[PDB]
């Protein structure tokens, strides 16, 4: 069933913005996030 | 008559495969060449 396939690499999920001169997106909720950086 | 000289198909080949305990299927890529004479 599973096999080796080839494909074009994706540059990220396409996400458009509803830009306008009379509206703005402001966050109503938030959260905390801990990330790791190993050097 | 003029005749152009071109080195025929030659280019570093490679082989791609996943981990061993995942599967045994393997792929081979002939790079910078058209494998029509293979």
């Amino acid at each position: 069933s599973q096999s080796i396939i080839a494909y074009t690499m994706s540059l990220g999920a396409e996400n458009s913005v509803a830009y306008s001169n009379n509206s703005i997106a402001i966050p109503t909720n938030f959260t905390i996030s801990v990330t790791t950086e190993i050097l | 008559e003029i005749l152009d000289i071109t080195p025929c198909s030659f280019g570093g080949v490679s082989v791609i495969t996943p981990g061993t305990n995942t599967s045994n299927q393997v792929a081979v890529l002939y790079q910078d060449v058209n494998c029509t004479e293979v």
């Binding site: 690499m9 540059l11 | 080195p7 030659f10 280019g11 570093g12 790079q31 910078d32």
Partner: peptide
């Protein structure tokens, strides 16, 4: 504005110019 058979070759980059422009 900006400008072989002896075992030395060039490899193409993973990210093409079109992806970089995008």
């Amino acid at each position: 504005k900006v400008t072989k058979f002896n075992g030395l070759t060039v490899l193409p980059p993973l990210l093409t110019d079109e992806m970089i422009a995008q």
